[PDB]
Amino acid sequence: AGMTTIVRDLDRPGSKFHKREVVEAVTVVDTPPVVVVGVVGYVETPRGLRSLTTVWAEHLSDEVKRRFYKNWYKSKKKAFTKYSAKYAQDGAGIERELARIKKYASVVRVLVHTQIRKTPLAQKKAHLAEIQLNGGSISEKVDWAREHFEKTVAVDSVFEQNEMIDAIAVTKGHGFEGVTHRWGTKKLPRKTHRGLRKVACIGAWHPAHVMWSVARAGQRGYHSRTSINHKIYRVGKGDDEANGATSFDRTKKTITPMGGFVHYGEIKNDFIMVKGCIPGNRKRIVTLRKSLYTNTSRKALEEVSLKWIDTASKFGKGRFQTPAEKHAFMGTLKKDL
Amino acid sequence: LKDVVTREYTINLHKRLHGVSFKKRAPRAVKEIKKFAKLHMGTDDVRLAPELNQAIWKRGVKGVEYRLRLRISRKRNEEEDAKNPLFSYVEPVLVASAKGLQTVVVEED
RNA sequence: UUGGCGGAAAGGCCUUGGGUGCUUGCUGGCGAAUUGCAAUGUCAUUUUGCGUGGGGAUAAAUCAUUUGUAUACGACUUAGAUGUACAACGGGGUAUUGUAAGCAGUAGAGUAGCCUUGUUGUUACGAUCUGCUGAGAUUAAGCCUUUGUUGUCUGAUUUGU
RNA sequence: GAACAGCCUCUAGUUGAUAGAAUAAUGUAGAUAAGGGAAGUCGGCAAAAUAGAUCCGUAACUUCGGGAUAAGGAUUGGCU
RNA sequence: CAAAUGAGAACUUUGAAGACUGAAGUGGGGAAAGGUUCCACGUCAACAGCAGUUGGACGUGGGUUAGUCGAUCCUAAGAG
């Protein structure tokens, strides 16, 4: 959704900012609860993990069938119609597929989809992905999936505060870029014929080819990136006014800034505030993944209590956090008689 | 005898011509008014009044007004009519200011 | 017809039973020529069709419009046949600037007189100042609703297991 | 305005130079830039700074004519 | 921007607007040179590096009036 600022007391026993307040950039990810619609089982083979079957839910959301379509509006909406016909019985072709996933498929992942209708984006096309279940036996995982069919999982169930996660996203695109900015090469001197935002020597005489390791112009951005070790600073609830309120501020205000998040809107759903930046731009789908190792660092184990969250306007230099505070500063106005 | 409607619109030439080169601003305003009429009445055949042209060019190439109050009347082609039976005629309507005005149907009466 | 078992690329293995045909296991009866003295002397397979029958449901993509989380062009996230959908305008929020036109003031450095015999009588003016007035103007063009108004919603091509 | 310089406008003339769409890189032309200030480079190349007018002030040297707009400072609108 | 003409108009014509040259002009004349390009009347073959209904193009025609303006006369450097 966007970036904002927090103030928190810093606690590392030995820094010169120990027990002193620090101002930190944070990224807000609006995370409405994702619906679990289906699961897939992967049998391990000497060629890797191979999916053996996918079992879907009985009723699928309109947004998920929109994901399955391209010209959704001029469609008969016939999607999983015969799958739901296969359904509506006890286990006519469903208990068998789940039993196959139990008997085989060492790795089982649930197919989940986002609530783009809850998110302020104009997409209406949900994002469907897989999420791997990482505990218990395969029978336990598939029982979990079948129990959670058509059910919405909230992010407070998976991600905790003071936790290190990884953000997987496609970074912001920047089109065709020159080598000077795409690779950070030294600019050529001002008196260079035929341009200077270039690499002067792109290779020796031999080998008589341009090598792959020489910097060239082309696409910048829109790359898949997986950045690790981002600390969750808050897991806030959408069904909760005073989201940005802490024990230090105690002001009834929502994480959404004054005038709304720029280019995005509001955070009327559950949200996560992570420390620092994450790959991708605003409005972009990001994937938040658990850490692949146990990180202590005496930084991952830091307990974070937020003292203040910035909710001033990001659409300029906003001097006020709340409309009540703005009115308190400026007094009565001509427009409000 | 339908498709002979006349409506008063307000077009935001500001958002239309944001970031345009100064020497192309009034020609682009003309083309944007044509596209506006096409989007609101579906008629490719958009004919602009010379007085509307004067309103657009009132302050030179780069001086196109921020908001223009237009009167778009969809009419029926005649006198060796073109491929489209319908055409739109875009007129200027004199107002003290073009702010605070909402699109309104006007009738021949 | 009855159990299954087999996921590494399972596409294979018996059986439970009913029906039918051969049996060289041991003995008989008829036939074979002439393809002429040999000539591979013709015997098994990723597809279909004016066609026949044991049965099944009537989908999408693409162009055009749109979008801007993309973009040299292609591509790429999106939307569009009645939805609390989309769009064009208007309030709000937000932000940028800095107090709008007009009107009024015994305000303003000063420049030229009246007579009804000089503590507000007044005129031809006068950059600026003050008040209405944190006013006015602009605000998505890459920040939202049509609780307000108004409109839009069946145009063209292709896809054989 | 010192000014047939640069800017704007009467008379007169022209509106001619293939166009449309979009706004990637690299270009050509024009700009801006924190803090530093030539560390860049053969070299301050290129650019920047200076600049009109009034007043004050103006050195070494000198062929006494200059140097000299030396250097170096201040002021500049509108109105009555 | 509209209208006209036209089979056909971004480019022709006529109105309307926006502009430009800005009087050492993109104005009004001339010298050398060109030679009919001047002017009127008709349309796509070529030409006007797009188009063209327009043209310095194509076809057919019309146009240059001197005692006073020049030449003519004189002499210059010079030629002979």
GROMACS .gro file of N, CA and C in nm, chain A residues 172-264:
model
  279
  172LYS      N    1   0.961  -0.275  -0.925
  172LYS     CA    2   0.899  -0.178  -1.014
  172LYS      C    3   0.970  -0.176  -1.148
  173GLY      N    4   0.892  -0.172  -1.256
  173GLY     CA    5   0.949  -0.167  -1.389
  173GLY      C    6   0.990  -0.027  -1.429
  174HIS      N    7   1.094  -0.020  -1.512
  174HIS     CA    8   1.145   0.109  -1.558
  174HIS      C    9   1.174   0.110  -1.707
  175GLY      N   10   1.120   0.014  -1.782
  175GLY     CA   11   1.134   0.012  -1.926
  175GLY      C   12   1.276  -0.015  -1.971
  176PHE      N   13   1.303   0.025  -2.094
  176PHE     CA   14   1.438   0.017  -2.150
  176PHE      C   15   1.526   0.120  -2.080
  177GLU      N   16   1.641   0.076  -2.030
  177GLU     CA   17   1.732   0.165  -1.958
  177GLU      C   18   1.871   0.159  -2.019
  178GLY      N   19   1.940   0.273  -2.013
  178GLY     CA   20   2.079   0.277  -2.052
  178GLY      C   21   2.168   0.207  -1.952
  179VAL      N   22   2.291   0.179  -1.997
  179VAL     CA   23   2.385   0.104  -1.915
  179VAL      C   24   2.428   0.183  -1.792
  180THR      N   25   2.434   0.317  -1.804
  180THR     CA   26   2.481   0.399  -1.693
  180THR      C   27   2.392   0.384  -1.570
  181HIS      N   28   2.260   0.382  -1.588
  181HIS     CA   29   2.171   0.363  -1.474
  181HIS      C   30   2.136   0.218  -1.449
  182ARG      N   31   2.136   0.135  -1.553
  182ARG     CA   32   2.101  -0.006  -1.537
  182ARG      C   33   2.211  -0.081  -1.462
  183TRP      N   34   2.336  -0.037  -1.475
  183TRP     CA   35   2.448  -0.106  -1.414
  183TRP      C   36   2.533  -0.018  -1.325
  184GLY      N   37   2.507   0.113  -1.321
  184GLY     CA   38   2.589   0.202  -1.242
  184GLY      C   39   2.731   0.216  -1.293
  185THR      N   40   2.749   0.221  -1.424
  185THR     CA   41   2.881   0.238  -1.482
  185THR      C   42   2.922   0.384  -1.479
  186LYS      N   43   3.054   0.406  -1.477
  186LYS     CA   44   3.107   0.542  -1.475
  186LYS      C   45   3.070   0.616  -1.603
  187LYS      N   46   3.018   0.737  -1.588
  187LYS     CA   47   2.984   0.819  -1.703
  187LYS      C   48   3.111   0.861  -1.777
  188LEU      N   49   3.102   0.864  -1.909
  188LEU     CA   50   3.215   0.905  -1.990
  188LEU      C   51   3.230   1.057  -1.985
  189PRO      N   52   3.350   1.109  -2.014
  189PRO     CA   53   3.373   1.253  -2.000
  189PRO      C   54   3.286   1.335  -2.094
  190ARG      N   55   3.272   1.464  -2.059
  190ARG     CA   56   3.179   1.552  -2.128
  190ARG      C   57   3.210   1.562  -2.277
  191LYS      N   58   3.338   1.558  -2.314
  191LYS     CA   59   3.379   1.576  -2.453
  191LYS      C   60   3.392   1.440  -2.522
  192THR      N   61   3.284   1.363  -2.516
  192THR     CA   62   3.280   1.232  -2.578
  192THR      C   63   3.191   1.238  -2.701
  193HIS      N   64   3.250   1.216  -2.818
  193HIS     CA   65   3.171   1.204  -2.940
  193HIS      C   66   3.080   1.082  -2.930
  194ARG      N   67   2.959   1.096  -2.984
  194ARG     CA   68   2.863   0.986  -2.995
  194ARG      C   69   2.812   0.937  -2.860
  195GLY      N   70   2.801   1.027  -2.763
  195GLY     CA   71   2.735   0.995  -2.638
  195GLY      C   72   2.831   0.949  -2.530
  196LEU      N   73   2.784   0.959  -2.405
  196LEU     CA   74   2.866   0.926  -2.290
  196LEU      C   75   2.795   0.844  -2.182
  197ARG      N   76   2.666   0.813  -2.198
  197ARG     CA   77   2.599   0.721  -2.106
  197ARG      C   78   2.615   0.577  -2.153
  198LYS      N   79   2.739   0.537  -2.180
  198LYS     CA   80   2.768   0.409  -2.241
  198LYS      C   81   2.889   0.347  -2.172
  199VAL      N   82   2.912   0.219  -2.200
  199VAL     CA   83   3.037   0.153  -2.163
  199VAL      C   84   3.133   0.169  -2.280
  200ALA      N   85   3.252   0.224  -2.252
  200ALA     CA   86   3.345   0.257  -2.358
  200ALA      C   87   3.393   0.131  -2.430
  201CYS      N   88   3.461   0.042  -2.359
  201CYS     CA   89   3.511  -0.082  -2.415
  201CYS      C   90   3.421  -0.197  -2.370
  202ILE      N   91   3.352  -0.259  -2.465
  202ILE     CA   92   3.263  -0.371  -2.435
  202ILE      C   93   3.333  -0.505  -2.458
  203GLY      N   94   3.464  -0.505  -2.472
  203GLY     CA   95   3.538  -0.629  -2.486
  203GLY      C   96   3.671  -0.607  -2.553
  204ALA      N   97   3.760  -0.704  -2.534
  204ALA     CA   98   3.888  -0.704  -2.601
  204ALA      C   99   3.872  -0.758  -2.743
  205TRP      N  100   3.982  -0.758  -2.818
  205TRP     CA  101   3.980  -0.818  -2.951
  205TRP      C  102   3.950  -0.967  -2.944
  206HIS      N  103   4.010  -1.037  -2.847
  206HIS     CA  104   3.985  -1.179  -2.829
  206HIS      C  105   3.944  -1.206  -2.685
  207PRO      N  106   3.839  -1.287  -2.661
  207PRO     CA  107   3.758  -1.361  -2.760
  207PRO      C  108   3.678  -1.269  -2.851
  208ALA      N  109   3.661  -1.305  -2.978
  208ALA     CA  110   3.602  -1.214  -3.075
  208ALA      C  111   3.450  -1.211  -3.061
  209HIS      N  112   3.403  -1.185  -2.939
  209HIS     CA  113   3.261  -1.177  -2.910
  209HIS      C  114   3.242  -1.083  -2.792
  210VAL      N  115   3.122  -1.027  -2.781
  210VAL     CA  116   3.085  -0.954  -2.660
  210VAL      C  117   3.053  -1.058  -2.554
  211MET      N  118   3.116  -1.045  -2.438
  211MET     CA  119   3.094  -1.142  -2.332
  211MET      C  120   2.965  -1.111  -2.257
  212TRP      N  121   2.908  -1.215  -2.196
  212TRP     CA  122   2.785  -1.201  -2.119
  212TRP      C  123   2.802  -1.109  -1.998
  213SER      N  124   2.925  -1.092  -1.950
  213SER     CA  125   2.951  -1.016  -1.828
  213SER      C  126   2.972  -0.868  -1.854
  214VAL      N  127   2.960  -0.823  -1.978
  214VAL     CA  128   2.971  -0.681  -2.011
  214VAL      C  129   2.834  -0.617  -1.998
  215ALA      N  130   2.832  -0.493  -1.948
  215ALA     CA  131   2.707  -0.424  -1.921
  215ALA      C  132   2.648  -0.367  -2.049
  216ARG      N  133   2.519  -0.394  -2.071
  216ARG     CA  134   2.449  -0.348  -2.191
  216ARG      C  135   2.315  -0.288  -2.151
  217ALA      N  136   2.260  -0.208  -2.242
  217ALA     CA  137   2.131  -0.145  -2.222
  217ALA      C  138   2.018  -0.245  -2.241
  218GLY      N  139   1.903  -0.213  -2.182
  218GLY     CA  140   1.788  -0.301  -2.191
  218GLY      C  141   1.689  -0.271  -2.080
  219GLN      N  142   1.607  -0.372  -2.050
  219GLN     CA  143   1.502  -0.357  -1.951
  219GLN      C  144   1.561  -0.338  -1.812
  220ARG      N  145   1.510  -0.239  -1.739
  220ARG     CA  146   1.540  -0.222  -1.598
  220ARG      C  147   1.412  -0.239  -1.518
  221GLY      N  148   1.421  -0.311  -1.408
  221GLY     CA  149   1.306  -0.332  -1.322
  221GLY      C  150   1.212  -0.438  -1.377
  222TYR      N  151   1.102  -0.457  -1.304
  222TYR     CA  152   1.008  -0.566  -1.330
  222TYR      C  153   1.077  -0.701  -1.319
  223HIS      N  154   1.166  -0.714  -1.221
  223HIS     CA  155   1.236  -0.837  -1.192
  223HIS      C  156   1.178  -0.901  -1.066
  224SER      N  157   1.178  -1.034  -1.063
  224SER     CA  158   1.139  -1.106  -0.943
  224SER      C  159   1.253  -1.099  -0.842
  225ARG      N  160   1.221  -1.057  -0.720
  225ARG     CA  161   1.319  -1.047  -0.612
  225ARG      C  162   1.261  -1.108  -0.485
  226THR      N  163   1.348  -1.175  -0.410
  226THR     CA  164   1.315  -1.237  -0.282
  226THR      C  165   1.411  -1.179  -0.179
  227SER      N  166   1.362  -1.086  -0.097
  227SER     CA  167   1.444  -1.019   0.002
  227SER      C  168   1.411  -1.073   0.140
  228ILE      N  169   1.513  -1.113   0.215
  228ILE     CA  170   1.494  -1.183   0.340
  228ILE      C  171   1.511  -1.086   0.457
  229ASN      N  172   1.469  -1.130   0.575
  229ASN     CA  173   1.498  -1.064   0.703
  229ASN      C  174   1.435  -0.925   0.710
  230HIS      N  175   1.304  -0.920   0.688
  230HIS     CA  176   1.225  -0.801   0.715
  230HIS      C  177   1.146  -0.825   0.843
  231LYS      N  178   1.158  -0.734   0.938
  231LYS     CA  179   1.096  -0.751   1.068
  231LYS      C  180   0.954  -0.694   1.066
  232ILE      N  181   0.859  -0.776   1.109
  232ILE     CA  182   0.720  -0.734   1.121
  232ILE      C  183   0.707  -0.641   1.241
  233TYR      N  184   0.669  -0.516   1.216
  233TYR     CA  185   0.654  -0.418   1.321
  233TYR      C  186   0.514  -0.411   1.377
  234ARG      N  187   0.413  -0.450   1.300
  234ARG     CA  188   0.278  -0.459   1.353
  234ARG      C  189   0.195  -0.553   1.267
  235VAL      N  190   0.111  -0.633   1.332
  235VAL     CA  191   0.006  -0.706   1.263
  235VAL      C  192  -0.128  -0.648   1.307
  236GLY      N  193  -0.180  -0.552   1.230
  236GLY     CA  194  -0.298  -0.480   1.270
  236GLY      C  195  -0.426  -0.538   1.211
  237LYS      N  196  -0.535  -0.522   1.285
  237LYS     CA  197  -0.663  -0.580   1.251
  237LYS      C  198  -0.750  -0.478   1.178
  238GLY      N  199  -0.809  -0.520   1.067
  238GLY     CA  200  -0.896  -0.431   0.992
  238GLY      C  201  -1.024  -0.397   1.066
  239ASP      N  202  -1.084  -0.495   1.133
  239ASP     CA  203  -1.201  -0.471   1.217
  239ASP      C  204  -1.158  -0.414   1.352
  240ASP      N  205  -1.087  -0.302   1.344
  240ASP     CA  206  -1.034  -0.238   1.464
  240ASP      C  207  -1.006  -0.092   1.432
  241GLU      N  208  -1.085  -0.002   1.488
  241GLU     CA  209  -1.051   0.138   1.481
  241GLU      C  210  -0.935   0.167   1.576
  242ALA      N  211  -0.867   0.279   1.553
  242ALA     CA  212  -0.741   0.310   1.621
  242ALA      C  213  -0.636   0.202   1.591
  243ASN      N  214  -0.618   0.174   1.462
  243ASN     CA  215  -0.515   0.079   1.420
  243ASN      C  216  -0.375   0.133   1.446
  244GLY      N  217  -0.352   0.261   1.417
  244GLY     CA  218  -0.222   0.321   1.434
  244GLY      C  219  -0.198   0.371   1.575
  245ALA      N  220  -0.293   0.344   1.664
  245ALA     CA  221  -0.284   0.385   1.804
  245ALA      C  222  -0.201   0.285   1.882
  246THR      N  223  -0.111   0.336   1.965
  246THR     CA  224  -0.025   0.256   2.050
  246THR      C  225  -0.042   0.299   2.195
  247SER      N  226   0.033   0.233   2.284
  247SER     CA  227   0.025   0.266   2.426
  247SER      C  228   0.084   0.403   2.458
  248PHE      N  229   0.165   0.460   2.368
  248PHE     CA  230   0.222   0.592   2.387
  248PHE      C  231   0.133   0.702   2.331
  249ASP      N  232   0.069   0.679   2.216
  249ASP     CA  233  -0.012   0.782   2.152
  249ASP      C  234  -0.156   0.780   2.200
  250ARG      N  235  -0.222   0.664   2.191
  250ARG     CA  236  -0.361   0.647   2.236
  250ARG      C  237  -0.456   0.744   2.166
  251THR      N  238  -0.436   0.764   2.036
  251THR     CA  239  -0.526   0.845   1.955
  251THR      C  240  -0.603   0.756   1.858
  252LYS      N  241  -0.734   0.776   1.851
  252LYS     CA  242  -0.822   0.689   1.776
  252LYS      C  243  -0.806   0.714   1.626
  253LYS      N  244  -0.699   0.662   1.567
  253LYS     CA  245  -0.672   0.686   1.426
  253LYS      C  246  -0.629   0.558   1.357
  254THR      N  247  -0.659   0.550   1.228
  254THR     CA  248  -0.628   0.435   1.145
  254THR      C  249  -0.496   0.457   1.072
  255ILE      N  250  -0.430   0.346   1.037
  255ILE     CA  251  -0.301   0.350   0.967
  255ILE      C  252  -0.310   0.429   0.837
  256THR      N  253  -0.428   0.435   0.776
  256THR     CA  254  -0.444   0.512   0.653
  256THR      C  255  -0.409   0.658   0.677
  257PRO      N  256  -0.319   0.717   0.598
  257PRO     CA  257  -0.279   0.857   0.622
  257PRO      C  258  -0.390   0.956   0.590
  258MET      N  259  -0.360   1.084   0.607
  258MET     CA  260  -0.455   1.189   0.571
  258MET      C  261  -0.468   1.197   0.420
  259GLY      N  262  -0.591   1.183   0.370
  259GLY     CA  263  -0.615   1.176   0.228
  259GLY      C  264  -0.593   1.040   0.167
  260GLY      N  265  -0.560   0.939   0.247
  260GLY     CA  266  -0.540   0.805   0.197
  260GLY      C  267  -0.399   0.783   0.145
  261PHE      N  268  -0.360   0.656   0.140
  261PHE     CA  269  -0.232   0.619   0.082
  261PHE      C  270  -0.227   0.665  -0.063
  262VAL      N  271  -0.117   0.729  -0.101
  262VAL     CA  272  -0.106   0.787  -0.234
  262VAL      C  273  -0.104   0.675  -0.337
  263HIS      N  274  -0.184   0.690  -0.442
  263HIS     CA  275  -0.200   0.598  -0.555
  263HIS      C  276  -0.268   0.468  -0.515
  264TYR      N  277  -0.295   0.445  -0.387
  264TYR     CA  278  -0.354   0.319  -0.342
  264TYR      C  279  -0.492   0.339  -0.281
   0.00000   0.00000   0.00000
